[PDB]
Amino acid sequence: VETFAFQAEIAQLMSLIINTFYSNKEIFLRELISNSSDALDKIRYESLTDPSKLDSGKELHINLIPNKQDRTLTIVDTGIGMTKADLINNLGTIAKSGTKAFMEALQAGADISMIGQFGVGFYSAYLVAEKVTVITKHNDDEQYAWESSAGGSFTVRTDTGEPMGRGTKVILHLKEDQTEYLEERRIKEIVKKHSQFIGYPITLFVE
C-alpha cells in the first residue's frame, strides 16, 4: 500500500468541500454519474477504431448500489477506467487548474453546485462521504484501489477483490447524517432531477 500527499491546492479544495456550510449536498450524485458517462463515452469512441477494446465487456452502463449494512452507496460504470498513472499523477495535474478556477469563482459569487463546470466534480463526493474508495480497471493495466478520507493523503494499492472486467466503482462511505442517500425514493428523485438524459442505462439496485 502506497501513501501519497495531495497537492496543496487539492487538499485546500477538499477542506473547502468538507468545511463550508452548504445544504444542497445531493448534487454529488449528478457529478459522479457525469464522470461515469464521460468514461463510458471514451471507451465507446475508442472501440469504434479498435473493437478488441470491448473484449473486457461489451455492456456500457451505470449501476447504483446502496448497502445499509456497510453504509455505502456505490456508483459502478463499465467505462474506460483509470491507470495507475491517472490515479497518482495525471488526474491531480489536470485538477490543479480547475481547482484554482473553481475557488476563484466561489470567491466571486459562484456556488458549490457549479463544481462540474471546472472538471473537479469528483471531489463533491466529500459532501456526503467520510471516506471514498475507488476500484478501477483499465485495459492492459492492473485493477487498483484508490482511497482517501481527506486529511491531505490518499493511498493506492493493487486490488485483490472480485475482478471487474473494465471500469470504475466509486464507493462512498457515507457520513452518519447522510444515510438518506441509501433510500430508494431519494436516489430515484435525485436521478430524475439532475441526471435524466444520461445516454447509458442507469440501474438502481434494491436492498
Ligand X SMILES: COc1cc(Cc2nc3ccccc3c3nc(N)nn23)cc(OC)c1
Query: In sequence order, which residues have a C-beta less than 8 Å from that of residue 32 and are 6 or more positions away?
Result: 75, 121, 122, 124, 125, 170
- Contact status: 23 vs a second copy (CB under 8 A): no
Residue 88 is given by DSSP the state I
Torsions phi, psi for 58 (to 5 deg)? -85, -30
91 touching ligand X, by CB under 6 A: yes
Instruction: Indicate which single residue of 17, 29, 39, 129 sits in contact with ligand X (rule: CB under 6 A).
Output: 39
82 binds, among a second copy, ligand X, none (CB under 5 to 8 A by kind): ligand X
The verdict on 77 binding ligand X (CB under 6 A) reads yes
Site string for ligand X, 19-38 (x = CB under 6 A): ----------------xx--
Whole-Å CA distances, 156 to 12, 49, 52, 130, 168: 21, 31, 28, 18, 14
Binding residues for ATP: 35, 77, 96, 122
Residues that bind ligand X (CB under 6 A): 35-36, 39, 77, 79-80, 82, 86-87, 91, 95, 122, 134, 146, 168
